Amino acid sequence: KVLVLALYDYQEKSPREVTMKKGDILTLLNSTNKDWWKVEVNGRQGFVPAAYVKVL
Secondary structure, eight states: OOEEEESSOBOOOSTTBOOBOTTOEEEEEEOOSSSEEEEEETTEEEEEEGGGEEEO
């Protein structure tokens, strides 16, 4: 699975989102949507804005 780096803090704002801290290394689960990527952040999966992460 592909890793992505959180470029920005993001606090979840909806039930399917997840929170990430800048600098976090997230496992990319689903990047099919242009705007929201499903990621795994420690022990949690959910969506964050695609723009706020960078594929490694």
